[PDB]
PDB file of C-alpha atoms in Angstrom:
ATOM      1  CA  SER A   1      83.461  70.158  74.645  1.00  0.00           C
ATOM      2  CA  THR A   2      80.876  72.734  73.551  1.00  0.00           C
ATOM      3  CA  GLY A   3      78.590  75.339  75.157  1.00  0.00           C
ATOM      4  CA  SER A   4      75.383  76.996  73.966  1.00  0.00           C
ATOM      5  CA  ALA A   5      73.450  79.791  75.710  1.00  0.00           C
ATOM      6  CA  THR A   6      70.471  81.993  74.861  1.00  0.00           C
ATOM      7  CA  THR A   7      71.035  85.745  75.042  1.00  0.00           C
ATOM      8  CA  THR A   8      68.043  88.077  75.544  1.00  0.00           C
ATOM      9  CA  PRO A   9      67.683  91.850  75.013  1.00  0.00           C
ATOM     10  CA  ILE A  10      67.161  93.722  78.309  1.00  0.00           C
ATOM     11  CA  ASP A  11      64.536  96.104  76.864  1.00  0.00           C
ATOM     12  CA  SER A  12      62.351  96.905  73.821  1.00  0.00           C
ATOM     13  CA  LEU A  13      65.260  98.865  72.219  1.00  0.00           C
ATOM     14  CA  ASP A  14      67.984  96.105  72.338  1.00  0.00           C
ATOM     15  CA  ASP A  15      70.194  98.444  74.467  1.00  0.00           C
ATOM     16  CA  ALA A  16      72.065  95.371  75.789  1.00  0.00           C
ATOM     17  CA  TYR A  17      71.829  91.545  75.863  1.00  0.00           C
ATOM     18  CA  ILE A  18      72.006  89.318  78.976  1.00  0.00           C
ATOM     19  CA  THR A  19      73.016  85.647  79.067  1.00  0.00           C
ATOM     20  CA  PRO A  20      72.606  83.359  82.099  1.00  0.00           C
ATOM     21  CA  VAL A  21      75.923  82.193  83.605  1.00  0.00           C
ATOM     22  CA  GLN A  22      76.392  79.666  86.461  1.00  0.00           C
ATOM     23  CA  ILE A  23      79.024  80.652  89.062  1.00  0.00           C
ATOM     24  CA  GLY A  24      80.190  78.544  92.018  1.00  0.00           C
ATOM     25  CA  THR A  25      79.095  75.287  93.688  1.00  0.00           C
ATOM     26  CA  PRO A  26      76.118  74.912  94.142  1.00  0.00           C
ATOM     27  CA  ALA A  27      75.377  77.093  91.063  1.00  0.00           C
ATOM     28  CA  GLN A  28      74.507  80.787  91.492  1.00  0.00           C
ATOM     29  CA  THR A  29      72.909  82.070  88.274  1.00  0.00           C
ATOM     30  CA  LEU A  30      73.713  85.598  87.207  1.00  0.00           C
ATOM     31  CA  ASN A  31      72.680  87.369  83.949  1.00  0.00           C
ATOM     32  CA  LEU A  32      75.836  88.790  82.405  1.00  0.00           C
ATOM     33  CA  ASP A  33      76.466  91.096  79.461  1.00  0.00           C
ATOM     34  CA  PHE A  34      78.824  89.278  77.047  1.00  0.00           C
ATOM     35  CA  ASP A  35      81.316  91.919  75.995  1.00  0.00           C
ATOM     36  CA  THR A  36      83.817  91.310  73.140  1.00  0.00           C
ATOM     37  CA  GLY A  37      85.159  94.869  73.831  1.00  0.00           C
ATOM     38  CA  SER A  38      86.572  94.035  77.305  1.00  0.00           C
ATOM     39  CA  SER A  39      88.447  91.197  79.064  1.00  0.00           C
ATOM     40  CA  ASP A  40      87.246  91.117  82.668  1.00  0.00           C
ATOM     41  CA  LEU A  41      84.617  88.817  84.155  1.00  0.00           C
ATOM     42  CA  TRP A  42      83.164  91.002  86.901  1.00  0.00           C
ATOM     43  CA  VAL A  43      79.997  90.614  88.965  1.00  0.00           C
ATOM     44  CA  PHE A  44      77.843  92.383  91.593  1.00  0.00           C
ATOM     45  CA  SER A  45      78.527  90.611  94.893  1.00  0.00           C
ATOM     46  CA  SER A  46      78.016  90.426  98.688  1.00  0.00           C
ATOM     47  CA  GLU A  47      81.049  92.863  98.855  1.00  0.00           C
ATOM     48  CA  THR A  48      79.434  95.591  96.653  1.00  0.00           C
ATOM     49  CA  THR A  49      78.554  98.815  98.562  1.00  0.00           C
ATOM     50  CA  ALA A  50      74.870  98.309  99.555  1.00  0.00           C
ATOM     51  CA  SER A  51      73.753 101.769  98.227  1.00  0.00           C
ATOM     52  CA  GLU A  52      75.208 100.954  94.765  1.00  0.00           C
ATOM     53  CA  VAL A  53      73.044  97.758  94.412  1.00  0.00           C
ATOM     54  CA  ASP A  54      69.463  98.146  93.106  1.00  0.00           C
ATOM     55  CA  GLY A  55      67.748  94.891  92.063  1.00  0.00           C
ATOM     56  CA  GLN A  56      70.794  92.953  90.800  1.00  0.00           C
ATOM     57  CA  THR A  57      71.369  89.298  91.713  1.00  0.00           C
ATOM     58  CA  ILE A  58      74.655  89.130  93.664  1.00  0.00           C
ATOM     59  CA  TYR A  59      77.380  86.509  93.693  1.00  0.00           C
ATOM     60  CA  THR A  60      78.091  85.341  97.289  1.00  0.00           C
ATOM     61  CA  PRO A  61      81.522  83.648  97.446  1.00  0.00           C
ATOM     62  CA  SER A  62      80.994  82.566 101.090  1.00  0.00           C
ATOM     63  CA  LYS A  63      78.142  80.246  99.897  1.00  0.00           C
ATOM     64  CA  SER A  64      80.384  78.557  97.261  1.00  0.00           C
ATOM     65  CA  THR A  65      82.513  75.474  98.197  1.00  0.00           C
ATOM     66  CA  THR A  66      84.813  76.025  95.170  1.00  0.00           C
ATOM     67  CA  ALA A  67      85.435  79.810  95.734  1.00  0.00           C
ATOM     68  CA  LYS A  68      89.019  80.842  96.681  1.00  0.00           C
ATOM     69  CA  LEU A  69      90.164  84.426  97.376  1.00  0.00           C
ATOM     70  CA  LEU A  70      93.007  85.368  95.000  1.00  0.00           C
ATOM     71  CA  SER A  71      95.158  86.861  97.757  1.00  0.00           C
ATOM     72  CA  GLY A  72      96.352  90.404  97.051  1.00  0.00           C
ATOM     73  CA  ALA A  73      94.832  90.703  93.569  1.00  0.00           C
ATOM     74  CA  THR A  74      92.761  93.798  92.732  1.00  0.00           C
ATOM     75  CA  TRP A  75      91.096  95.109  89.530  1.00  0.00           C
ATOM     76  CA  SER A  76      89.950  98.499  88.283  1.00  0.00           C
ATOM     77  CA  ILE A  77      88.283  99.138  84.908  1.00  0.00           C
ATOM     78  CA  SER A  78      86.937 102.218  83.021  1.00  0.00           C
ATOM     79  CA  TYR A  79      84.679 101.813  79.961  1.00  0.00           C
ATOM     80  CA  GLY A  80      84.280 103.906  76.756  1.00  0.00           C
ATOM     81  CA  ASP A  81      81.010 105.438  78.027  1.00  0.00           C
ATOM     82  CA  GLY A  82      82.759 106.774  81.176  1.00  0.00           C
ATOM     83  CA  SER A  83      81.375 104.063  83.504  1.00  0.00           C
ATOM     84  CA  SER A  84      83.671 102.142  85.915  1.00  0.00           C
ATOM     85  CA  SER A  85      84.031  99.416  88.574  1.00  0.00           C
ATOM     86  CA  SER A  86      86.651  97.879  90.895  1.00  0.00           C
ATOM     87  CA  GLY A  87      87.173  95.284  93.626  1.00  0.00           C
ATOM     88  CA  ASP A  88      88.911  92.088  94.632  1.00  0.00           C
ATOM     89  CA  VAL A  89      89.327  88.732  92.869  1.00  0.00           C
ATOM     90  CA  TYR A  90      88.119  85.238  93.540  1.00  0.00           C
ATOM     91  CA  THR A  91      88.719  82.041  91.557  1.00  0.00           C
ATOM     92  CA  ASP A  92      85.654  79.774  91.075  1.00  0.00           C
ATOM     93  CA  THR A  93      83.927  77.344  88.692  1.00  0.00           C
ATOM     94  CA  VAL A  94      82.032  79.128  85.873  1.00  0.00           C
ATOM     95  CA  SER A  95      79.701  77.448  83.348  1.00  0.00           C
ATOM     96  CA  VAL A  96      78.087  78.861  80.207  1.00  0.00           C
ATOM     97  CA  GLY A  97      75.388  76.700  78.579  1.00  0.00           C
ATOM     98  CA  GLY A  98      76.937  73.455  79.819  1.00  0.00           C
ATOM     99  CA  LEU A  99      80.590  74.482  79.186  1.00  0.00           C
ATOM    100  CA  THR A 100      82.578  74.497  82.431  1.00  0.00           C
ATOM    101  CA  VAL A 101      85.825  76.201  83.413  1.00  0.00           C
ATOM    102  CA  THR A 102      87.360  75.510  86.815  1.00  0.00           C
ATOM    103  CA  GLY A 103      89.542  78.175  88.451  1.00  0.00           C
ATOM    104  CA  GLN A 104      88.152  81.111  86.428  1.00  0.00           C
ATOM    105  CA  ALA A 105      89.024  84.537  87.862  1.00  0.00           C
ATOM    106  CA  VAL A 106      85.718  86.109  88.992  1.00  0.00           C
ATOM    107  CA  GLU A 107      86.163  89.794  89.791  1.00  0.00           C
ATOM    108  CA  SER A 108      83.977  90.802  92.725  1.00  0.00           C
ATOM    109  CA  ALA A 109      82.838  94.437  92.583  1.00  0.00           C
ATOM    110  CA  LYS A 110      83.276  96.557  95.740  1.00  0.00           C
ATOM    111  CA  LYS A 111      82.425  99.826  93.887  1.00  0.00           C
ATOM    112  CA  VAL A 112      80.359 100.373  90.682  1.00  0.00           C
ATOM    113  CA  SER A 113      79.448 103.678  88.962  1.00  0.00           C
ATOM    114  CA  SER A 114      75.759 104.878  88.772  1.00  0.00           C
ATOM    115  CA  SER A 115      75.451 103.575  85.167  1.00  0.00           C
ATOM    116  CA  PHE A 116      75.679  99.935  86.395  1.00  0.00           C
ATOM    117  CA  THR A 117      73.515 100.506  89.513  1.00  0.00           C
ATOM    118  CA  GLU A 118      70.606 101.866  87.410  1.00  0.00           C
ATOM    119  CA  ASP A 119      70.634  98.810  85.084  1.00  0.00           C
ATOM    120  CA  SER A 120      68.876  96.353  87.467  1.00  0.00           C
ATOM    121  CA  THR A 121      68.798  93.599  84.767  1.00  0.00           C
ATOM    122  CA  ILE A 122      72.591  93.321  84.313  1.00  0.00           C
ATOM    123  CA  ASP A 123      74.434  91.397  87.061  1.00  0.00           C
ATOM    124  CA  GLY A 124      77.882  91.904  85.509  1.00  0.00           C
ATOM    125  CA  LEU A 125      80.047  91.576  82.415  1.00  0.00           C
ATOM    126  CA  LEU A 126      81.808  88.605  80.806  1.00  0.00           C
ATOM    127  CA  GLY A 127      84.729  89.927  78.768  1.00  0.00           C
ATOM    128  CA  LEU A 128      85.523  88.168  75.447  1.00  0.00           C
ATOM    129  CA  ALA A 129      88.269  90.448  74.020  1.00  0.00           C
ATOM    130  CA  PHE A 130      92.008  89.257  74.234  1.00  0.00           C
ATOM    131  CA  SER A 131      93.483  88.560  77.742  1.00  0.00           C
ATOM    132  CA  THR A 132      96.025  91.419  77.316  1.00  0.00           C
ATOM    133  CA  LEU A 133      93.220  93.883  78.289  1.00  0.00           C
ATOM    134  CA  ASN A 134      92.487  92.217  81.682  1.00  0.00           C
ATOM    135  CA  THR A 135      92.864  94.686  84.581  1.00  0.00           C
ATOM    136  CA  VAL A 136      93.825  92.233  87.360  1.00  0.00           C
ATOM    137  CA  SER A 137      97.048  93.237  89.119  1.00  0.00           C
ATOM    138  CA  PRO A 138      99.753  92.296  89.948  1.00  0.00           C
ATOM    139  CA  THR A 139      98.915  89.033  88.111  1.00  0.00           C
ATOM    140  CA  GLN A 140      96.926  89.456  84.878  1.00  0.00           C
ATOM    141  CA  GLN A 141      94.087  86.919  84.466  1.00  0.00           C
ATOM    142  CA  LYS A 142      92.702  85.035  81.453  1.00  0.00           C
ATOM    143  CA  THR A 143      89.215  85.421  79.948  1.00  0.00           C
ATOM    144  CA  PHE A 144      86.588  82.612  80.103  1.00  0.00           C
ATOM    145  CA  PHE A 145      87.123  81.956  76.371  1.00  0.00           C
ATOM    146  CA  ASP A 146      90.915  81.722  76.844  1.00  0.00           C
ATOM    147  CA  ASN A 147      90.518  79.295  79.762  1.00  0.00           C
ATOM    148  CA  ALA A 148      88.015  77.115  77.823  1.00  0.00           C
ATOM    149  CA  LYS A 149      90.083  77.038  74.538  1.00  0.00           C
ATOM    150  CA  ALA A 150      91.959  73.765  75.251  1.00  0.00           C
ATOM    151  CA  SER A 151      88.691  71.897  75.975  1.00  0.00           C
ATOM    152  CA  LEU A 152      86.668  73.271  73.022  1.00  0.00           C
ATOM    153  CA  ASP A 153      86.133  71.139  69.867  1.00  0.00           C
ATOM    154  CA  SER A 154      87.114  74.283  67.817  1.00  0.00           C
ATOM    155  CA  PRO A 155      88.732  77.435  69.355  1.00  0.00           C
ATOM    156  CA  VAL A 156      85.737  79.594  68.312  1.00  0.00           C
ATOM    157  CA  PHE A 157      82.660  81.293  69.672  1.00  0.00           C
ATOM    158  CA  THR A 158      79.742  82.600  67.669  1.00  0.00           C
ATOM    159  CA  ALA A 159      77.412  85.557  68.246  1.00  0.00           C
ATOM    160  CA  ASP A 160      73.935  85.318  66.746  1.00  0.00           C
ATOM    161  CA  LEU A 161      72.079  88.380  68.165  1.00  0.00           C
ATOM    162  CA  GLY A 162      68.349  88.873  67.595  1.00  0.00           C
ATOM    163  CA  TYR A 163      66.468  91.994  66.509  1.00  0.00           C
ATOM    164  CA  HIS A 164      63.931  92.562  69.360  1.00  0.00           C
ATOM    165  CA  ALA A 165      64.246  88.813  70.000  1.00  0.00           C
ATOM    166  CA  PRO A 166      66.457  86.281  71.808  1.00  0.00           C
ATOM    167  CA  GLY A 167      69.651  85.047  70.188  1.00  0.00           C
ATOM    168  CA  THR A 168      72.463  82.595  70.829  1.00  0.00           C
ATOM    169  CA  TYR A 169      76.096  82.520  71.943  1.00  0.00           C
ATOM    170  CA  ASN A 170      77.784  79.194  71.016  1.00  0.00           C
ATOM    171  CA  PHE A 171      81.259  78.022  72.079  1.00  0.00           C
ATOM    172  CA  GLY A 172      83.350  75.344  70.326  1.00  0.00           C
ATOM    173  CA  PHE A 173      81.235  74.779  67.200  1.00  0.00           C
ATOM    174  CA  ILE A 174      79.660  76.549  64.200  1.00  0.00           C
ATOM    175  CA  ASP A 175      75.928  75.922  63.760  1.00  0.00           C
ATOM    176  CA  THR A 176      75.480  75.511  59.950  1.00  0.00           C
ATOM    177  CA  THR A 177      71.694  75.963  60.294  1.00  0.00           C
ATOM    178  CA  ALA A 178      71.973  79.492  61.861  1.00  0.00           C
ATOM    179  CA  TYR A 179      73.082  81.277  58.633  1.00  0.00           C
ATOM    180  CA  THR A 180      72.532  81.397  54.837  1.00  0.00           C
ATOM    181  CA  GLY A 181      75.196  81.230  52.092  1.00  0.00           C
ATOM    182  CA  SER A 182      78.872  81.179  53.048  1.00  0.00           C
ATOM    183  CA  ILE A 183      80.890  82.645  55.901  1.00  0.00           C
ATOM    184  CA  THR A 184      83.374  85.291  54.734  1.00  0.00           C
ATOM    185  CA  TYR A 185      86.475  85.399  56.962  1.00  0.00           C
ATOM    186  CA  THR A 186      88.667  88.468  57.459  1.00  0.00           C
ATOM    187  CA  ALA A 187      91.955  89.186  59.253  1.00  0.00           C
ATOM    188  CA  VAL A 188      92.048  90.260  62.894  1.00  0.00           C
ATOM    189  CA  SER A 189      94.731  92.491  64.379  1.00  0.00           C
ATOM    190  CA  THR A 190      95.281  91.792  68.123  1.00  0.00           C
ATOM    191  CA  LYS A 191      97.703  94.760  68.600  1.00  0.00           C
ATOM    192  CA  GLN A 192      95.239  96.781  70.761  1.00  0.00           C
ATOM    193  CA  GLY A 193      93.670  93.685  72.436  1.00  0.00           C
ATOM    194  CA  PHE A 194      90.379  93.962  70.496  1.00  0.00           C
ATOM    195  CA  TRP A 195      88.756  91.913  67.729  1.00  0.00           C
ATOM    196  CA  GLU A 196      90.003  94.593  65.244  1.00  0.00           C
ATOM    197  CA  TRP A 197      89.338  94.179  61.512  1.00  0.00           C
ATOM    198  CA  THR A 198      88.992  96.163  58.256  1.00  0.00           C
ATOM    199  CA  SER A 199      85.686  96.672  56.515  1.00  0.00           C
ATOM    200  CA  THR A 200      85.981  97.108  52.736  1.00  0.00           C
ATOM    201  CA  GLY A 201      83.331  99.833  52.389  1.00  0.00           C
ATOM    202  CA  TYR A 202      79.731 100.896  52.636  1.00  0.00           C
ATOM    203  CA  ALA A 203      76.522 101.787  50.815  1.00  0.00           C
ATOM    204  CA  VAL A 204      73.529 103.935  51.928  1.00  0.00           C
ATOM    205  CA  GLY A 205      70.137 102.442  50.955  1.00  0.00           C
ATOM    206  CA  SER A 206      70.050 101.478  47.276  1.00  0.00           C
ATOM    207  CA  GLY A 207      73.093 103.688  46.502  1.00  0.00           C
ATOM    208  CA  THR A 208      76.407 102.745  44.937  1.00  0.00           C
ATOM    209  CA  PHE A 209      78.905 100.851  47.088  1.00  0.00           C
ATOM    210  CA  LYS A 210      81.879 103.022  48.097  1.00  0.00           C
ATOM    211  CA  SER A 211      85.108 100.943  48.417  1.00  0.00           C
ATOM    212  CA  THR A 212      87.061 102.443  51.320  1.00  0.00           C
ATOM    213  CA  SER A 213      88.939 100.808  54.216  1.00  0.00           C
ATOM    214  CA  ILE A 214      87.258 101.300  57.616  1.00  0.00           C
ATOM    215  CA  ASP A 215      89.243  99.943  60.545  1.00  0.00           C
ATOM    216  CA  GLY A 216      87.038  99.043  63.524  1.00  0.00           C
ATOM    217  CA  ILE A 217      86.321  96.528  66.292  1.00  0.00           C
ATOM    218  CA  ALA A 218      83.564  93.855  66.574  1.00  0.00           C
ATOM    219  CA  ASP A 219      82.044  94.898  69.913  1.00  0.00           C
ATOM    220  CA  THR A 220      79.038  93.055  71.420  1.00  0.00           C
ATOM    221  CA  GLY A 221      79.161  95.349  74.479  1.00  0.00           C
ATOM    222  CA  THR A 222      78.408  98.552  72.531  1.00  0.00           C
ATOM    223  CA  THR A 223      74.795  99.161  71.445  1.00  0.00           C
ATOM    224  CA  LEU A 224      75.331 101.419  68.415  1.00  0.00           C
ATOM    225  CA  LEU A 225      77.403 101.587  65.223  1.00  0.00           C
ATOM    226  CA  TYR A 226      80.141 104.300  65.442  1.00  0.00           C
ATOM    227  CA  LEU A 227      81.708 105.188  62.092  1.00  0.00           C
ATOM    228  CA  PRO A 228      83.849 108.081  60.648  1.00  0.00           C
ATOM    229  CA  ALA A 229      82.171 111.509  60.336  1.00  0.00           C
ATOM    230  CA  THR A 230      82.271 111.368  56.487  1.00  0.00           C
ATOM    231  CA  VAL A 231      80.318 108.060  56.369  1.00  0.00           C
ATOM    232  CA  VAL A 232      77.800 109.071  59.060  1.00  0.00           C
ATOM    233  CA  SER A 233      77.076 112.464  57.391  1.00  0.00           C
ATOM    234  CA  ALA A 234      76.473 110.634  54.031  1.00  0.00           C
ATOM    235  CA  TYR A 235      73.925 108.327  55.763  1.00  0.00           C
ATOM    236  CA  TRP A 236      71.980 111.055  57.679  1.00  0.00           C
ATOM    237  CA  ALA A 237      71.902 113.343  54.574  1.00  0.00           C
ATOM    238  CA  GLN A 238      69.415 110.786  53.081  1.00  0.00           C
ATOM    239  CA  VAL A 239      66.899 111.196  55.951  1.00  0.00           C
ATOM    240  CA  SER A 240      64.640 114.267  55.667  1.00  0.00           C
ATOM    241  CA  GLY A 241      64.898 116.438  58.768  1.00  0.00           C
ATOM    242  CA  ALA A 242      67.862 114.578  60.307  1.00  0.00           C
ATOM    243  CA  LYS A 243      70.443 116.673  62.136  1.00  0.00           C
ATOM    244  CA  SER A 244      73.278 116.357  64.631  1.00  0.00           C
ATOM    245  CA  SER A 245      72.105 117.742  67.980  1.00  0.00           C
ATOM    246  CA  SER A 246      74.635 118.934  70.605  1.00  0.00           C
ATOM    247  CA  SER A 247      71.912 118.910  73.324  1.00  0.00           C
ATOM    248  CA  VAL A 248      71.116 115.247  72.634  1.00  0.00           C
ATOM    249  CA  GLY A 249      74.693 114.199  71.872  1.00  0.00           C
ATOM    250  CA  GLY A 250      74.266 112.834  68.356  1.00  0.00           C
ATOM    251  CA  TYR A 251      72.169 112.484  65.222  1.00  0.00           C
ATOM    252  CA  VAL A 252      68.389 112.640  65.731  1.00  0.00           C
ATOM    253  CA  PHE A 253      65.632 112.317  63.105  1.00  0.00           C
ATOM    254  CA  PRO A 254      61.819 112.908  62.854  1.00  0.00           C
ATOM    255  CA  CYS A 255      60.061 109.757  64.196  1.00  0.00           C
ATOM    256  CA  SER A 256      57.787 109.871  61.099  1.00  0.00           C
ATOM    257  CA  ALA A 257      60.694 109.404  58.605  1.00  0.00           C
ATOM    258  CA  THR A 258      61.592 106.056  57.014  1.00  0.00           C
ATOM    259  CA  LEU A 259      65.255 105.034  57.474  1.00  0.00           C
ATOM    260  CA  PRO A 260      67.315 103.654  54.593  1.00  0.00           C
ATOM    261  CA  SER A 261      69.368 100.513  55.123  1.00  0.00           C
ATOM    262  CA  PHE A 262      73.172 100.589  55.590  1.00  0.00           C
ATOM    263  CA  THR A 263      75.498  98.085  53.908  1.00  0.00           C
ATOM    264  CA  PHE A 264      79.053  97.339  55.130  1.00  0.00           C
ATOM    265  CA  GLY A 265      81.678  95.271  53.291  1.00  0.00           C
ATOM    266  CA  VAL A 266      83.444  92.154  54.621  1.00  0.00           C
ATOM    267  CA  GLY A 267      86.048  91.328  51.974  1.00  0.00           C
ATOM    268  CA  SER A 268      83.988  90.801  48.816  1.00  0.00           C
ATOM    269  CA  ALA A 269      80.748  90.043  50.785  1.00  0.00           C
ATOM    270  CA  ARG A 270      78.096  92.598  51.865  1.00  0.00           C
ATOM    271  CA  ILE A 271      76.167  92.727  55.154  1.00  0.00           C
ATOM    272  CA  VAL A 272      72.889  94.725  54.934  1.00  0.00           C
ATOM    273  CA  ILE A 273      71.571  96.377  58.096  1.00  0.00           C
ATOM    274  CA  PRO A 274      67.829  97.046  57.633  1.00  0.00           C
ATOM    275  CA  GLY A 275      66.605 100.619  58.236  1.00  0.00           C
ATOM    276  CA  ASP A 276      64.454  99.454  61.223  1.00  0.00           C
ATOM    277  CA  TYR A 277      67.587  98.357  63.158  1.00  0.00           C
ATOM    278  CA  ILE A 278      68.861 101.987  63.069  1.00  0.00           C
ATOM    279  CA  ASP A 279      65.735 103.370  64.883  1.00  0.00           C
ATOM    280  CA  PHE A 280      66.353 103.820  68.645  1.00  0.00           C
ATOM    281  CA  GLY A 281      63.012 105.538  69.339  1.00  0.00           C
ATOM    282  CA  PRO A 282      62.100 108.865  70.934  1.00  0.00           C
ATOM    283  CA  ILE A 283      64.838 110.853  72.730  1.00  0.00           C
ATOM    284  CA  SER A 284      62.342 111.338  75.618  1.00  0.00           C
ATOM    285  CA  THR A 285      58.834 109.951  76.299  1.00  0.00           C
ATOM    286  CA  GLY A 286      56.289 111.559  73.981  1.00  0.00           C
ATOM    287  CA  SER A 287      58.946 113.301  71.866  1.00  0.00           C
ATOM    288  CA  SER A 288      58.623 113.356  68.077  1.00  0.00           C
ATOM    289  CA  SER A 289      62.491 113.313  67.676  1.00  0.00           C
ATOM    290  CA  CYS A 290      64.073 109.842  67.464  1.00  0.00           C
ATOM    291  CA  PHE A 291      67.634 108.681  68.235  1.00  0.00           C
ATOM    292  CA  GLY A 292      69.793 107.274  65.453  1.00  0.00           C
ATOM    293  CA  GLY A 293      71.642 103.954  65.663  1.00  0.00           C
ATOM    294  CA  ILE A 294      74.531 105.218  63.425  1.00  0.00           C
ATOM    295  CA  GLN A 295      76.723 107.796  65.144  1.00  0.00           C
ATOM    296  CA  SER A 296      80.087 109.441  64.584  1.00  0.00           C
ATOM    297  CA  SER A 297      83.190 107.880  66.122  1.00  0.00           C
ATOM    298  CA  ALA A 298      85.109 111.251  65.988  1.00  0.00           C
ATOM    299  CA  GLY A 299      84.880 111.863  69.748  1.00  0.00           C
ATOM    300  CA  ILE A 300      85.822 108.181  70.569  1.00  0.00           C
ATOM    301  CA  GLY A 301      88.957 107.623  68.470  1.00  0.00           C
ATOM    302  CA  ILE A 302      87.977 104.150  67.252  1.00  0.00           C
ATOM    303  CA  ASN A 303      85.311 102.793  64.869  1.00  0.00           C
ATOM    304  CA  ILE A 304      82.899 100.377  66.578  1.00  0.00           C
ATOM    305  CA  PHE A 305      80.750  97.735  64.910  1.00  0.00           C
ATOM    306  CA  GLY A 306      78.359  97.391  67.850  1.00  0.00           C
ATOM    307  CA  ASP A 307      75.088  95.441  68.261  1.00  0.00           C
ATOM    308  CA  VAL A 308      73.329  97.470  65.451  1.00  0.00           C
ATOM    309  CA  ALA A 309      75.771  95.945  62.901  1.00  0.00           C
ATOM    310  CA  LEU A 310      76.447  92.558  64.564  1.00  0.00           C
ATOM    311  CA  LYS A 311      72.720  91.659  64.974  1.00  0.00           C
ATOM    312  CA  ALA A 312      72.342  91.828  61.155  1.00  0.00           C
ATOM    313  CA  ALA A 313      74.855  88.923  60.781  1.00  0.00           C
ATOM    314  CA  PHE A 314      75.957  85.486  62.104  1.00  0.00           C
ATOM    315  CA  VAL A 315      79.407  86.328  63.552  1.00  0.00           C
ATOM    316  CA  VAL A 316      82.283  83.875  64.065  1.00  0.00           C
ATOM    317  CA  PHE A 317      85.033  84.891  66.496  1.00  0.00           C
ATOM    318  CA  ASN A 318      87.896  82.483  65.581  1.00  0.00           C
ATOM    319  CA  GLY A 319      90.430  82.341  68.416  1.00  0.00           C
ATOM    320  CA  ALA A 320      92.893  80.114  66.516  1.00  0.00           C
ATOM    321  CA  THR A 321      96.679  81.057  66.682  1.00  0.00           C
ATOM    322  CA  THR A 322      96.002  83.347  63.709  1.00  0.00           C
ATOM    323  CA  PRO A 323      92.674  84.918  64.794  1.00  0.00           C
ATOM    324  CA  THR A 324      89.931  85.755  62.247  1.00  0.00           C
ATOM    325  CA  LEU A 325      86.330  87.133  62.164  1.00  0.00           C
ATOM    326  CA  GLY A 326      83.665  85.467  60.038  1.00  0.00           C
ATOM    327  CA  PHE A 327      80.483  87.100  58.796  1.00  0.00           C
ATOM    328  CA  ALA A 328      77.478  85.482  57.184  1.00  0.00           C
ATOM    329  CA  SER A 329      73.992  86.674  56.271  1.00  0.00           C
ATOM    330  CA  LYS A 330      71.084  85.180  58.264  1.00  0.00           C
TER     331      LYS A 330
END
């Protein structure tokens, strides 16, 4: 079996991508944020505190004939940005682009932080990292990808994110028309529960490629590219007027400047991120200072290849017994 779903940016800056997901019987369609940096499928629901809901579509388990309360199970998660959510657990049928899993753990939110409430376009998250990160207790639950694995033609999913445009998430097959050249595969370490890999280096604009190992995670749920201070300083040094601002919380640059591209290595292959993808627009409405898409990972403790990097490539997440990541130009 296979699945194929269109993912759409929530705004003009590609801050996040939402994909329609069918939950329950009859289907209730929610727009979820596919997150390869987490392992919980959680949604806004009829149980979420009324004041913490602002425009989201809610999942209503009482209207679903296949919904079953997972007696005693609770969940609590905290994200890298400081946001959080918690609640109880239901099992129900979940479908993504025609691919169906019965008995998927659907985590119903009772409480959500202000960050989620303010994003009216996101109805929840669908975690695609390894099941070891799932927060359901006392019985840890499996991700949608893990549950679908046996039924898939190939144990893979692909991320093909668009730049200011819709993209595609495919499950169980590799679309050979979605990329150019070959796919370069690289080793994944599952030790921390993430799709963790090692980039072979970088180049700024038309500069010389610097071979240096950069350990990081392929994270669809993070908007920006977070890299070591040394790399990030070398990139922003090529932009006239760029500086790190403590008031803003990162590198900013004059909106009038042109941004060089950024190249990252995948084995012997190179993925080029165009300069335009690194522009996140004015820090405030009418401001002439713009926010950079390449930021330091020093305060985070882990390097993150977020949407800025992933949208420049066709990405294969191979969930075989020996997991790998594939990158191709597109």
